Amino acid sequence: METSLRYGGDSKALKIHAKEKLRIDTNTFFQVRGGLDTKTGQPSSGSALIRHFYPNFSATLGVGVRYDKQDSVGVRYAKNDKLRYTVLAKKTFPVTNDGLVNFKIKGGCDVDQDFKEWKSRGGAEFSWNVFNFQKDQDVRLRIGYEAFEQVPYLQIRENNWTFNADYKGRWNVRYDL
Structure with a gap:
């Protein structure tokens, strides 16, 4: 149970994101995040991950989704009001000292349930x-991005x-509480 503050500019002022974990099976982990609205004192959005790990091939495989609340959809x-889901591998490689880099990546594909849109991502830093x-x-620089053909920040x-x-001219801070 950890809490993090997310600041935003040219979008939203302040928002809270907190993370929780649950043991479902011997080799299955629950990992999810709750975003509490800028207004402060209500939900905002939810995300969750189901993951399994491999030992020798130090990595995990799982799926991630997010729910945005429904309001009105039609001409506009x-x-x-949209659900998306994705499946990816998570891998970490420290290549500093001997080299000069270090990354933690999400490698996989996401679909938006709203319009058949499918993309692959260097969902990484x-x-x-x-x-x-x-x-x-x-x-230290890392692209908080989905690299393929979508958007890097x-x-x-x-x-x-x-x-x-x-x-999109958007910026933010993330700081642990």
């Missing part, structure tokens, strides 16, 4: 080293905060 459409500035302030770590930019 809205961001809400890939650690790469770029700066080239006189200042000695080290920064960047995530960087500085001091002890995580902040991002999306091509």
